[PDB]
């Protein structure tokens, strides 16, 4: 069967380069057009190159054109991804897909038959940081039937993942903690709420523990009306 | 640039038939019939399920069949069976030698009875404001079928600047959370009257507002 394995993939500094490969087996390479595709972390696809059969031109998305360059070697059945000047936005799984239709000039007849499982491009500056943790208070706003609504805010950390409690494990029921967002700094944020009874907030103590292990941070903080 | 355009959400139950649109222009999707699509599991590569408009690859099911008319495009999946629930994309020739993917459709196969998100937001805390930063945090939770759109309002207007979302991710009751951020000065903050976060699921909107101290 087609077989396309694709590598190269790291973390690159914001203004730095990268070269992907693809190598292919399992048909006859060379002629084939060959294309990129991405895809951001829970984003969709998006097409990135195409290199046609036999030498002719290259096509490229407008948001690569300028940045990025692909090539192929017939004598090592590879494909390039020459990546310069890269972007946050630029990270993303790399897709090496190959074209259906035999010796085609474009991204054009029969699609994308075959992909590869993909190289992860990391453009990021972030480095190992712990949260700053913020309360997030109940209020009116965040309480109805009896029963409050009350969190703490996990900002800007790295990287992957926090753990939070809540009174040391004690409180179980009611707690959840979200997934966190990637922000374009390249750091994380996430949010941890409780829902306890509004008749409680006066007399109970409600503590969350947050624990960074990457950095090795640990915060407890009272959140209260 | 933009994207073909497809629904975030389609659904259906086993054994139901469901079709998923993709909307070019004349520039693509109407313009020839290059027009292909692909499926893809969480964690997973895309595979191909269609090509050229209407022709299946083989290995690939029966259930599934495409077609196009106009400036649309659709695939439609027949006798829904659980596997089928998974992201799918098309994809399009267009006149510029390009390809193009549409923004990619979230199939569920319901198993459970469709359920609106529970909205709760948070506006900046008193120590952050100190700290010379503002967030607001609009989560979103016990959703189904996993998929919401976000929009944020200062007073009454729409707001698209400092807005980070997350994709939804599966809970342990199998509906969906969400989480989404307004990073704001805390000027901005305190000039306005009040910010709203507006969650839209399978058509309906749930909104909840909050306002400075």
């Known amino acids: 069967e087609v077989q396309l394995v694709e590598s190269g993939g790291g973390v690159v500094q914001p203004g730095g380069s990268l070269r992907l490969s693809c190598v292919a087996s399992g048909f006859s390479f060379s002629d084939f057009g060959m294309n990129w595709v991405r895809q951001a972390p829970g984003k969709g696809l998006e097409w990135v190159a195409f290199?046609?059969?036999?030498?002719?031109?290259?096509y490229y998305a407008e948001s690569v054109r300028g940045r990025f360059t692909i090539s192929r070697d017939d004598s090592k059945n590879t494909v390039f991804l020459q990546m310069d000047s890269l972007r946050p936005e630029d990270t993303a799984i790399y897709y090496c897909?190959?074209?259906?239709?035999?010796?085609?000039?474009?991204?054009?007849?029969?699609?994308?038959?075959?992909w590869g499982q993909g190289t992860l491009v990391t453009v990021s500056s972030a480095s190992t940081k712990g949260p700053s943790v913020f309360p997030l208070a109940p209020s009116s706003k965040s309480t109805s039937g009896g029963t409050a609504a009350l969190g703490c805010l996990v900002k800007d950390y790295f990287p992957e993942p926090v753990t939070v409690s809540w009174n040391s494990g004690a409180l179980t029921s009611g707690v959840h903690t979200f997934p966190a967002v990637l922000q374009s700094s390249g750091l994380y944020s996430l949010s941890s709420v409780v829902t306890v009874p509004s008749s409680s907030l006066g007399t109970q103590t409600y503590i969350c523990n947050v624990n960074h292990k990457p950095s090795n941070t640990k915060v407890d903080k009272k959140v209260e009306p | 640039q933009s994207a073909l355009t497809q629904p975030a959400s389609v659904s259906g139950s086993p054994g139901q038939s469901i079709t998923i649109s993709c909307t070019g222009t004349s520039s693509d999707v109407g313009g020839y019939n290059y027009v292909s699509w692909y499926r893809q599991h969480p964690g997973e590569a895309p595979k191909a399920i269609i090509f050229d408009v209407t022709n299946r690859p083989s290995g690939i099911s029966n259930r599934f069949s495409g077609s196009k008319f106009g400036n649309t495009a659709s695939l439609t999946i027949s006798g829904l069976q659980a596997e089928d629930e998974a992201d799918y994309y098309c994809?399009?020739?267009?006149?510029?030698?390009?390809?193009?993917f549409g923004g990619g459709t979230k199939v569920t196969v319901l198993r459970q009875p469709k359920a609106a998100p529970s909205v709760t937001l948070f506006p900046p805390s008193s120590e952050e404001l100190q700290a010379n930063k503002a967030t607001l945090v609009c989560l979103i939770s016990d959703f189904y079928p996993g998929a919401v759109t976000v929009a944020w309002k200062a007073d009454s207007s729409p707001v698209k600047a400092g807005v980070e979302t997350t994709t939804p991710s599966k809970q342990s009751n199998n509906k969906y959370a969400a989480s989404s951020y307004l990073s704001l000065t805390p000027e901005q903050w305190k000039s306005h009257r009040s910010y709203s976060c507006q969650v839209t699921h399978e058509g309906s909107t749930v909104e909840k507002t909050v306002a400075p101290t």
């Open positions: 994809a399009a020739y267009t006149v510029a030698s390009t390809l193009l």
């Open positions: 897909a190959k074209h259906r239709s035999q010796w085609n000039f474009w991204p054009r007849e029969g699609g994308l038959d075959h």
């Open positions: 290199v046609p059969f036999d030498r002719r031109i290259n």
